[PDB]
């Protein structure tokens, strides 16, 4: 499936000093007309390890995918996060060209549902699977004002996959301030990509089936 969400407009990413230079990405960028949305999430290299941070309101970011070719000739690792559980898997995924976690309504009861088949078409010769409490916890609370910041570190050099994370409140606008598991995965990691969740509903005559829409989302990256 994976209808080809893509955008013509692209810009040289701005960067800020982390208090080293870290590049700043916009995933969904609002138009001055408020009309069009820019879907773009590049693949990126993985030089030894990566520092990842974002500030977020609405669960737009749900996990990451890691591998080398990101296709059926090789293993790849996938992390994705429900409202209630994380699941971690190694399988020989066939990723499509623009993966996202689609979510849609299910009229026969009052529920929203999301489906993994919008990110891959098939899996085979799968091996490792694990489940736990979620990583993308909401902060236990702050009354807005950039109500959270979340930071992660990924490291693989030792022959293991290691996550680190922290959650903190914050105050400063639009800039970085001056203010969990160890997995025995056997894999070669060289590139990675983040996956968003997008929602669709039928509410107005004559709209396209590609109704997929989301709010603004942004994140920062920097290499070890």
């Amino acid at each position: 499936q994976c209808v080809n969400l893509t955008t013509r407009t692209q810009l040289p990413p701005a960067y800020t000093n982390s208090f080293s230079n870290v590049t700043w990405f916009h995933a969904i960028h609002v138009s001055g007309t408020n009309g069009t949305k820019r879907f773009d999430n590049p693949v990126l290299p993985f030089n030894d390890g990566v520092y990842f941070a974002s500030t977020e309101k609405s669960n737009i970011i749900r996990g990451w995918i890691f591998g080398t070719t990101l296709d059926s000739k090789t293993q790849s690792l996938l992390i994705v996060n429900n409202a209630t559980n994380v699941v971690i898997k190694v399988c020989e995924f066939q990723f499509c060209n623009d993966p996202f976690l689609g979510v849609y309504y299910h009229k026969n009861n009052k529920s929203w549902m999301e489906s993994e088949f919008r990110v891959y078409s098939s899996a085979n010769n799968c091996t490792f699977e694990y489940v736990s409490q979620p990583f993308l916890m909401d902060l236990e609370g702050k009354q807005g004002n950039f109500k959270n910041l979340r930071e992660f570190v990924f490291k693989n050099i030792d022959g293991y996959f290691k996550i680190y994370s922290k959650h903190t409140p914050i105050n400063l606008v639009r800039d970085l301030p001056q203010g969990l598991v160890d997995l025995p995965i056997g894999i070669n990691i060289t590139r990675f990509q983040t996956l968003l969740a997008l929602h669709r509903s039928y509410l107005t005559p004559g709209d396209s089936s590609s109704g997929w829409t989301a709010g603004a989302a942004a994140y920062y990256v920097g290499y070890l």
Partner: antibody
Amino acid sequence: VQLVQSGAEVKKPGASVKVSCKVSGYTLTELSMHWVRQAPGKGLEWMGGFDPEDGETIYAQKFQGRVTMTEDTSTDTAYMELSSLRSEDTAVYYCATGPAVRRGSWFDPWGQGTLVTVSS
Amino acid sequence: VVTQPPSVSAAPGQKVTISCSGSSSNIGNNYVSWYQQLPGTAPKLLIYDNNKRPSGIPDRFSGSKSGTSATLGITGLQTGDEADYYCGTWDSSLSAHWVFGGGTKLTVL
């Protein structure tokens, strides 16, 4: 959304009938479904359909006993079936759809219609 | 049942109006919508929520509500518009259901 429904049928009185609506470019579970009838030269007559407020199918007062509705959610076809045909049942039957999260005021895509005739 | 006039008549370019009227239960309580049917072809949605036009509808069409009646305004009449027009609404009775008006033929001289 695109719709295609099964072609015309010719039968003798007292028979039942079943027609299908195939929905494509979208998934059936998001859509409300309705059936509407036109006899020759007459106005449109609504037969029944799903009501968002009930989470249930609703039937038109004159038909209640005669009509049934079902789905193959494995092949996203809706079905409608009618018993006890008679000559004044001869009409063109249309498939139409609308919003499901709220009671909409409209049905936007309509099928091409199909004509059922019964004689002798 | 909501009432409608049987027919209306004019030459090209003049004004004409279509009128749909009935109980407070049908028209008054809820929104109205309007449909056009060409002879031998499936109906098409024209206007919804009293006034909004979906994409591609020309400007010559407008809609209004008048208590428990509602009306359609046509501008610039062109000879292609030999068609039926129907109002439709929900019914707010305990016998809650959708209702279509009797339809009107538009003829142009």
